[PDB]
Amino acid sequence: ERPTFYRQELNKTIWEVPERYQNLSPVGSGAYGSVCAAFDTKTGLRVAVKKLSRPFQSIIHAKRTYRELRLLKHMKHENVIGLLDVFTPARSLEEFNDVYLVTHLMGADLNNIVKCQKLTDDHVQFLIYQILRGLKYIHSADIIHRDLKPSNLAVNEDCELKILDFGLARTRWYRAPEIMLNWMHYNQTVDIWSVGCIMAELLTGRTLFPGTDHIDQLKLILRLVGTPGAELLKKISSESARNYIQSLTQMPKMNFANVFIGANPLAVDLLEKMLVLDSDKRITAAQALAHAYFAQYHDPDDEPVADPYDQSFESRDLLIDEWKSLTYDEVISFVPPP
């Protein structure tokens, strides 16, 4: 089924992709690979052709490459960017060294949209609901984005959203308190927290937690949510961290009502449930969708869950060529959407 490949050097970098891809325009890249916007003659859609020329330079790289693929291949949801295509100019495993990922380039990222337009409460309502609907699907497979930010959310003119660029590691602002200072093994809710941070910004138009350093940021957060309690401290793995915490000031929880005056009460109500200090007390994706702040959009029949994602590989100690082989197999097993 090997299509025809056409090579062309774009900005001092070689690109060998199938002919179905035309008009490749370098749209950026960073140390994980370069990116090139293009037109997929197969689906008549503007896609993002990512090339990872350094996929197996280390067991850390090899695994992270296999992880990204596995995750991508699994994502089959409306509000979640899925794998449109994955290929390699390699004719065998021996010569296999470059891997290309192909997704759908939809509209522009939330950040940009903000800079050019003042969204209405209605917009936020639908936007955030979509983020949650996608999260429920993800978390359902037991996955955690870990890097949700207005720069990782694609939206078009129709207001359609999509969660993308998952944290593949296993500008600090949209990160929970625990994960930021690595207080303990994170919870799926850590994405919820980020959700809040996004939500707040949209409504106010200002960044909720624009903290300079971890300490500075932490102080910022704890000033609104307050300071830990004996229950939270318990969950603290690091003794040094627990020690630091105890050393802090008073910090009684702030009433959100006064912080966002003029905004939809239902909204502010939602923000309190999401922005809880105790990750074990933060509203879940499923629960949120049920919140009255999404009454106009909530359908318990049209919020679907995902199949089981086998993360067993995470605990697999293998060599670079084995992680390379595993990645190649997946590349060959790929079955394109409809």
């Binding site: 903000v114 050019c116 639908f126 207001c159 138009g205 300079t212 912080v259 005056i261």
Partner: protein, 317 residues
């Protein structure tokens, strides 16, 4: 000032004036040494070039020599011709000495070389918006050679504004305002710069947090609050007049010649340096608000698979 001639993009074949990623070419009648950047001809590639062209004045900015509107292959290509700077990449030179200690005053003799350019560009209402290693260069390889900069791929037109804010908030917390812009835009350069003085000093990254303060850090507390006013947030952000109105920069070359360990730490390990290089490019692209993205339609007019479904059941009920 002094009215200068406008830019006229020579329509003729570039191959008749010079002799067959920036590429080198050798002119015919001078046989000069001569950097050439190529692209897909269009208004953004022309608007930018017009800006880069009108930005050759400053001795701190690379000089474009000739702009041709030609037809390579099937497409029309706007081929610029510029003054080559074989001095070498800024972080390429330092990375690879040797013994010699990059002394504080040297780092200062650098920021001014860059703070001078910004002061120029910004004074003509031009926002560069792209400050990273790959775009900074020296001119010769020997001594007494100055550094003038490159790659205006992301510069644009800022608009004439002005800067205060203080102390303390009120009861309506927060609200909204003019989203680029004549201020915010400029604050994407200073970030690039301050974010450079730090990668210049500890050769570490704000990923901010200063070194332990022990450890290659003396710089002064006057050297901490500076990289801090440059660092975070783009409203009271560090002001290219205020920055140039600083003794450390203004009266540079008098500053201590404190020896540094920056060149040894970064050179110690030159692969995370590439990784750091990406995040800088990623960081920037994430704070640059320039090319329109969409203009989301009112939810009432918007129509998509999800909305339809919700509206359908909304009527069954």
């Amino acid at each position: 000032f002094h009215v200068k001639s406008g830019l006229q993009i020579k329509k003729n074949a570039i191959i008749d004036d010079y002799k067959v990623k920036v590429l080198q070419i050798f002119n015919k009648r001078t046989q000069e040494k001569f950097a050439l950047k190529m692209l897909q001809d269009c208004p953004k590639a022309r608007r930018e070039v017009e800006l880069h062209w009108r930005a050759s004045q400053c001795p701190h900015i690379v000089r474009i020599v000739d702009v041709y509107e030609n037809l390579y292959a099937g497409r029309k290509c706007l081929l610029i011709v510029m003054e080559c700077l074989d001095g070498g990449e800024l972080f390429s030179r330092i990375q690879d000495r040797g013994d010699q200690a990059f002394t504080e005053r040297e780092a200062s003799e650098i920021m001014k070389s860059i703070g001078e350019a910004i002061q120029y560009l910004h004074s003509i209402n031009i926002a560069h918006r792209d400050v990273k290693p790959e775009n900074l260069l020296y001119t010769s390889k020997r001594p007494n050679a100055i550094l003038k900069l490159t790659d205006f791929g992301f510069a644009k037109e800022t608009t004439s504004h002005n800067s205060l804010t203080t102390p303390c908030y009120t009861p309506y917390y927060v609200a909204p305002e003019v989203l680029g812009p004549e201020k915010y835009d400029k604050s994407c350069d200073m970030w690039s710069l301050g974010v450079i003085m730090y990668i210049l000093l500890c050769g570490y990254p704000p990923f901010y947090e200063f070194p332990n303060p022990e450890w290659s850090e003396v710089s002064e507390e006057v050297k901490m609050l500076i990289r801090n006013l440059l660092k975070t947030e783009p409203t009271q952000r560090m002001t290219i007049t205020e920055f140039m109105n600083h003794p450390w920069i203004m009266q540079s070359t008098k500053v201590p010649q404190t020896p540094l360990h920056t060149s040894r730490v970064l050179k110690e390990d030159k692969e995370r340096w590439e990784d750091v290089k990406e995040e800088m490019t990623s960081a920037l692209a994430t704070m640059r608000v320039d090319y329109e993205q969409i203009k989301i339609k009112k939810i009432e007019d918007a129509s998509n698979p999800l909305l339809l479904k919700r509206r359908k059941k909304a009527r069954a009920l």
